[PDB]
Symmetry: D2
Subunit: 470 residues, 4 copies
């Protein structure tokens, strides 16, 4: 049962809009909105959205598998060995937010301080002592972006698995000699860095020039979560504020996906007339090029929504009904909607490019969608015995045979997958967890969870006190 199975199960249920029914539904962890910083919903005058993995949640593991297959096929097409075609995507291996070390060809799970929590070379999980040879301080400088690449998006899941597949394949293929920084095939040397660049380039190619979009749109039921509560929630937002879309995707793809998301024989509620998806938005902006969007952006263009092409020229005019924009900047949105930053709740899945930058550069309020949480929360409550045993052990230790701590940490972690929880390894929080806490005001498995709280709701987090204040 994948996280998207959980989401689709919840999506299939019609909304019970009775106040006590809603209040009772959000008592369950699965349907809750979680709060890092207090947020008075009455102060929000604008709700903004990304599309991919926010409005359009791609089903798992089918979508990652398609991405994986197409990326493999591209690498074979440019000259990688035929044996790559025997790889098959395995959803139990990758966890999001891992760091690929291009020097030594390892996937690393790290905390917020760059300390190593997990290290795998191909499919070999390297134990603590063996890690010291390459990482003498069990530490990486994570801002050394020439060396380290952080795989923090859901689109990076297939390449995370593919990197480990390739390191495994080359290591075990007798044609190649394994060296510290790559593989020797006689007079050819393939560094892990060059191999990584080929994989990154191929994923980009699949998305931007290959058939991923085409294959997705040909079978939207297979690939995209559909929820009749989506139009309902967006209609309620528009009754109390303005609603906008700001997506990096192009208009033609956006229109296909959004049309499917709204394709029900009714509008917001059963029995109401169906309305086109564009009617749910005060402002629609495509080709946003986030994160640059939150600084200088690019010139504001107007989409000819008949031809799907850009009108020639920079658009200098006002916000009008039926206009679709392309490019621009976060300031365009603010100015056109008459909004200040703190009036905006921006809802997206990109912990860096969406949520971090909108918060740091503009002071927008943020809602982070974390699709994996829909399954991680099930594991967390099912296996709470293991975590509680770890707490008790960490407590008893502070005052001999702490191999027990390592073993319980392992058993706990394996419940989430080979690379453990997105949010921790045992008692140590990941970089990803720390970034969520720091930059997401609110977070949840889905933004649809906002449906279960009234719009006057005050989301509350406890005040933080320093050690000397306590």
């Amino acid at each position: 049962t994948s996280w998207s199975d959980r989401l689709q199960n919840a999506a299939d249920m019609p909304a019970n809009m009775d106040k006590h029914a809603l209040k009772k539904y959000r008592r369950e962890a699965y349907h809750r909105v979680f709060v890092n910083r207090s947020l008075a919903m009455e102060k929000i005058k604008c709700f903004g959205f990304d599309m991919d993995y926010t409005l359009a949640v791609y089903k798992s593991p089918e979508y990652e598998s398609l991405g994986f297959e197409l990326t493999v096929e591209r690498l074979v097409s440019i000259g990688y060995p035929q044996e790559l075609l025997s790889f098959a995507y395995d959803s139990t291996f990758p966890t999001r937010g891992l760091v690929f070390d291009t020097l030594y060809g390892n996937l690393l799970k790290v905390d917020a301080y760059g300390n190593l929590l997990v290290c795998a070379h191909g499919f070999n999980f390297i134990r603590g002592p063996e890690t010291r040879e390459q990482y003498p301080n069990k530490f990486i400088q994570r801002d050394d972006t020439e060396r380290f690449y952080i795989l923090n998006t859901l689109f990076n899941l297939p390449e995370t698995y593919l990197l480990a597949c390739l390191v495994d394949f080359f290591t075990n293929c007798p044609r190649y000699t394994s060296c510290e920084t790559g593989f020797k095939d006689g007079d050819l040397f393939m560094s892990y860095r060059s191999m990584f660049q080929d994989v990154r380039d191929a994923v980009d190619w699949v998305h931007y020039k290959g058939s991923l979009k085409e294959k997705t749109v040909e079978n939207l039921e297979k690939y995209v979560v559909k929820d009749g509560k989506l139009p309902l929630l967006l209609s309620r937002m528009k009754e109390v504020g303005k609603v906008f879309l700001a997506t990096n995707s192009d208009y033609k793809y956006t229109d296909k996906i959004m049309t499917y998301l709204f394709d029900f024989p009714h509008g917001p509620k059963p029995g109401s007339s169906h309305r086109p998806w564009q009617s749910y938005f005060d402002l629609i902006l495509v080709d946003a090029r986030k994160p640059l969007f939150f600084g200088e952006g690019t010139v504001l263009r107007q989409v000819d929504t008949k031809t799907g092409k850009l009108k020639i020229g920079t658009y200098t005019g006002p916000l009008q009904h039926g206009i679709v924009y392309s490019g621009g900047s976060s300031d365009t949105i603010c100015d056109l909607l008459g909004a200040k930053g703190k009036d905006i709740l921006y809802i997206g899945d990109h912990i860096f490019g969406d949520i971090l930058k909108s918060k740091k550069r503009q002071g927008w309020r943020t809602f982070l969608v974390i699709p994996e949480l829909a399954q991680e929360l099930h594991v967390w409550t099912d296996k709470s015995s293991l975590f509680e045993e770890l707490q008790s052990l960490d407590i008893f230790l502070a005052e001999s045979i702490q191999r027990r701590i390592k073993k319980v940490t392992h058993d706990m972690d394996m419940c989430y997958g080979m690379m453990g929880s997105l949010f921790r390894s045992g008692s140590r929080q990941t970089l990803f967890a720390s970034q969520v806490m720091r930059y997401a005001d609110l977070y949840a498995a889905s933004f649809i969870n906002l449906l279960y709280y009234p719009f006057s709701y005050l989301f509350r987090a406890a005040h933080v006190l320093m050690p000397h204040e306590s």
Copy 2:
């Protein structure tokens, strides 16, 4: 009673080295080490130090006043008006960590997200609504380093006050016309940005070319905290590990200051032979040029400790007894001392250049000295009624006349000074507080507080859980 009066009072007391006496002394907030992340002291094999405001704690407000006077005198010498000479340093105005906005000439106290907590134009404290004209979202982009300068060092205290003095002076002097971005004097226009640059340049000049060092060394009792427990603590560190100095200051100044710090008619304990300060260190490095030090650094040089000048050439040799180094990098230290990052406790006062960079770039353990805490802690326990009333009010509010919250916030804040606590304004934490929590493993008013804990001590912080884990 200044924070340095508190420190010197504590410094005057001889150490009672009985185990129960030590254990009882660190029960008091004033003598405690505070813990952001757990730290097993038995794992530390090297203790590293900065000099200024760490080993050599400059007395307040005398030292800031000297800096202020010399900076004023430099500005008058280059052509600023004679009226500047009537300014007098006021220690009740500046709090460390304020942001000077060079566009509008305001000092701002901000939280970690750039939200405005306090705004003053000269000596006029601007209320919330009047702030909206210049800061529509009550927010600044703090990484816009062309516009904003963050005054986060103790050496920045005099310029913090001086900026406000100058904005006040020019505003009220009939020769100048106040404009949005500076002052017009007929055919001359002085922007706040140019005025800020002159002040920054003059502070630099005072430190590097003027008489600040000379005036300091002429009266070390007036300007520098002296504590017989300093040699005792450093001797105990050297019994269990290596000790090093890495200072941006030059050897001639370092030698004067350190000689004074160790000038007692005894060594570590009363009755022991006096030993030269250099004997307390396994490695002494001057001219460190931190923060660059924690990346590429500069070439390693050797000090001729007789002439005080650098020997010609890059030093290629080993760590030898009696050698003093200049420049180099953090890697030099690690290699020469045979240390990995996590083996090192680095003790300093610069929350950015010392503590942030050693943690982020190298994974060193960190101890932040915060001299103001020695007085802030007294205010915090004396006026705990006001804070507790604020908690109660914030609680009751969450479920009308919240002018009461603003008033109590003001009365609380004014107990610390005109710009409030270093760590908060009312219930909102400052940027500085957030940076301490994030990058200082341990912190205290003085590193001497380590004397009251055994070297096997396990400093403990509670584990952090995300909202969905709780």
Copy 3:
């Protein structure tokens, strides 16, 4: 009669290899090699070539017209108006080396000091006084690369004409309002800068993603000069030294073009066995990415010449017979061929990326192919009366009615085309001329002209003396 008609006429003639016949043939301007700096041919141990417009000389105006048509079609496909399809390439308009001013939308012909010689806005040639409003000093800063783009390649000929067509079209189309920096179409504004970027992007697209290569290879007789003397000359070079190819083009295109260039029912001379084109080269390098090639370059790769794809890995091995390389650097060539810079004669058409950089960065000897010279030389000798009259007028003037100088300058210039000679306007030399003189040791309409000189030939230029030395 185009310059490529002249070249093909000369190409059709078999070589008369009698020494007196050769000596007599190079007496004619058309078949001469011109000399800017003395060059002893006996010191050359390696001959290096670019492909495009050097070995493969594209016929004119057919090739420029194809490029033009495809670029227009791309712009219409992305949303430019249908009226663009009525444009037709005119070879009488563009001269190579013009500067597009993106601020004001003018094509400019300039001297080496940035002084204006010709200015056209669309098809309107702007006279001297009217030029002063936009160019107060009749001067541009040609290194302001954000504003000015220098159209110095033969591939830039179609876009040179297309820019002028578009400025004309928009100016005269009643839908748009002409402004100083572009065109207003209601709420859309198209700056000349944005229009220029669309044209540049479309030319790139045609070459790299569109059908230009495909259409070229489908009709090589229409598009490419073929000369049986090419194999003869290259065979003679290989008897006295090494021969290499270093092309930015990919192997698949290179192989098609080169196969056609060598497709005769004989080898070097009539009656000899045909040999594959690759046999004429000691080293073949594709994907060179000049000008970067002359600095750090990219990693050296090996082409699988069966699949046409790159082998995986960096190539670490020696120069072997039958190997084809991709990427690398100029140092790769030198090292693999055992050559020093001055041992190499590098033959190409790119006055910047080939010839300038090989000379300045590596001290290679240079031969610049200037295909237009094959026709310019005919105009120069036919209309020498006009130039001689200009000399006489310039002489008489130096010691009233100099409108005569302007008129004769115009009549002379118009003999070459609307934008005059590549090398001058009247008595003023162009930037392009100055760059040829400075960086081309030797130059000619075709490198085939080397066939008419023996390999011991000493090419001689007169020594340069400063004014004070004369």
Copy 4:
């Protein structure tokens, strides 16, 4: 007899202002203005000047010797060996425009293409074959500014000699071991690069913080050429146009030097009232920071000419009589004087920062002062036999024992000094010569030579024709 002895001899003669006397005087090479590009003097509406080595020509070798002595003294003061004090400036060694190779510690004289003409390691002149080990292609990449420093100013003369003295000293001092890239003194290694940086820093220090200016102003007769014809020429310029000063020097130094230059018991001509130097200028600008001046510059400031300090603020007002400016940009000058670039003749000695940038960035007309020409011209006419013999030999060779060419080249070169003529080595022109030809419209040993031509004079250079045009 130094070049400044020649200049002062010419300076001592009063001006004979009879038209036939002037016309006859400029017939002599010494008093001529040389012409690279034609310049109609009637089109010049503004004459602009640098001060140092233009208006204020420092006597040789006294001034270079003072610079040398002070630079040596600074290096000894920071820890260089005492033996440096035994060095004594030798004017027969340095020629301007040499390249210091920081990798190998050689001074190189190069042509415009980076080809080696002379190589010296310390005082050892390295012959052609021995040069090949370090320079395999007898070539350097002169834009590799990390490695090569071009000593092209008259202020660089003392450091040119000092670099060679230091390489000689360290090579021959038994304490140091000579290595390929510097000197080893046990555990210290001094690279040529670090040694070069210390010398460069010390020259800067002497000029900006040391006693060079003070020692100069204490004995202006010893150090500065004084010519009663200077006020006469400047007065004549002001009758036909505007006159400005734009100097990097500060006002206090400028005022001392300029006061001395105008200190005669008369004004422009004998018998006229003396006038202050400032009266000769329409605009006076100090602290110019050229070459940045010719781009963005710095903010325009006003000098308080009583206090010598800057008024506070950016100066926003008009050009007024008696105002002195500081900083600004070349555009300030143009706007304030109502000049276009080609209306300005800018007169200076810096072939890069003055003359190159004013020409390339602004299209100003240029007059380069080359003080050494006053003596080089004497050598050129005295030893014309040697050059003529070289021409004849180069001619006879083109159609065996060319050791004769090398010997005559040597004897010729040695007439100018150990590093030969500024402008050539034998028949090969230097980089400096090529830069003069390219960027100086006019040049001379002194700008005073303009006095001998009427202001309607048309300076004529012959038109340049390409090889194919001839």
